[PDB]
Design an enzyme around this catalytic site. Structure first.
Site, PDB file in Angstrom:
ATOM      1  N   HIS A  36       0.804  -1.199   0.000  1.00 44.32           N
ATOM      2  CA  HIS A  36       0.000   0.000   0.000  1.00 44.32           C
ATOM      3  C   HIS A  36       0.855   1.276   0.000  1.00 44.32           C
ATOM      4  CE1 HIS A  36       0.331  -0.025   4.554  1.00 44.32           C
ATOM      5  NE2 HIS A  36       0.290   1.289   4.351  1.00 44.32           N
ATOM      6  N   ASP A  63      -0.517  -7.487   0.985  1.00 41.54           N
ATOM      7  CA  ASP A  63       0.021  -6.134   1.199  1.00 41.54           C
ATOM      8  C   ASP A  63       1.560  -6.219   1.152  1.00 41.54           C
ATOM      9  OD1 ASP A  63       0.467  -3.477   1.630  1.00 41.54           O
ATOM     10  OD2 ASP A  63      -0.448  -3.390   3.659  1.00 41.54           O
ATOM     11  N   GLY A 141       2.819   5.632   9.165  1.00 39.71           N
ATOM     12  CA  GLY A 141       4.149   5.851   8.651  1.00 39.71           C
ATOM     13  C   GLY A 141       5.139   4.714   8.954  1.00 39.71           C
ATOM     14  N   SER A 143       4.259   1.745   8.338  1.00 39.65           N
ATOM     15  CA  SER A 143       3.983   0.745   7.303  1.00 39.65           C
ATOM     16  C   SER A 143       5.223   0.485   6.455  1.00 39.65           C
ATOM     17  CB  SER A 143       2.888   1.278   6.358  1.00 39.65           C
ATOM     18  OG  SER A 143       1.641   1.271   6.987  1.00 39.65           O
ATOM     19  N   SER A 159       1.858  -3.851   7.964  1.00 41.44           N
ATOM     20  CA  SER A 159       0.718  -3.568   7.081  1.00 41.44           C
ATOM     21  C   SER A 159      -0.246  -2.549   7.675  1.00 41.44           C
ATOM     22  CB  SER A 159      -0.010  -4.882   6.711  1.00 41.44           C
ATOM     23  OG  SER A 159      -1.179  -4.624   5.944  1.00 41.44           O
TER      24      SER A 159
END
Length: 198
Positions: A36, A63, A141, A143, A159
């Site tokens: 993502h 993801d 952030g 992620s 994720s």
């Protein structure tokens, strides 16, 4: 740039995410991260400089992504822990109940335990299945960033999770946190990647 798990990078001069792990694909240098975070061909920057582009992604459903880096980048078998480092030693998947930590540009290095596997997240864009849940805290952030055991076994990439109004889930008890990562092994096999280890 030096490629270390947990550090910030930007995507098309816009969103921020965190590096997962240094990898190779034959002669090609790369890092894994969350799908993502970017679309195919989006430009990654670290320290103000272009470092590479998104080679491939799956999101939602899964993801995952990897960023294909220029040859000038320096791949390292490391994850940030404050000013020090955790060495990446392998990719053995830990069981429910194991301790695990994660690293990223918003909340830094945080630890907890693995509480469940095969969890579905219902994100804005669609469902993502198959995620592992822990109770280390995280925030927006983080992620893409590394999940790793203290013994150096790389688990996956951040994720999502039940962030609160402050943008993280660090202000609620561990018992209330759902912090979800994409398992590393299917990323490595889907893209033919080898983990950089030390």
């Amino acid at each position: 740039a030096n490629i270390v798990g947990g550090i910030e990078y930007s995507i098309n001069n816009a969103s921020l995410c965190s590096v997962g792990f240094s990898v190779t694909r034959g002669a090609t240098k790369g890092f894994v991260t969350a799908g993502h975070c970017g679309t195919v061909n989006a430009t990654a920057r670290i320290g103000g400089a272009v470092v590479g582009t998104f080679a491939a992604r799956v999101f939602p459903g899964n993801d995952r992504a990897w960023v294909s880096l220029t040859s000038a980048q320096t791949l390292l078998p490391r994850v940030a822990n404050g000013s020090s480092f955790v060495t990446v030693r392998g990719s053995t998947e830990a069981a429910v109940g194991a301790a695990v930590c994660r690293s990223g540009r918003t909340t830094g290095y945080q630890c907890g335990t693995i509480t469940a596997k095969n969890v579905t997240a219902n994100y804005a864009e669609g469902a993502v299945r198959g995620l592992t849940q822990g109770n280390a805290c995280m925030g927006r952030g983080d992620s893409g960033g590394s999940w790793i055991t203290s013994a150096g076994q790389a688990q996956g990439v951040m994720s999502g999770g039940n962030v609160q109004s402050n943008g993280n889930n660090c202000g609620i008890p561990a018992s209330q946190r759902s912090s979800l990562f994409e398992r590393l092994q299917p990323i490595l096999s889907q893209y033919g990647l080898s983990l950089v280890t030390g």
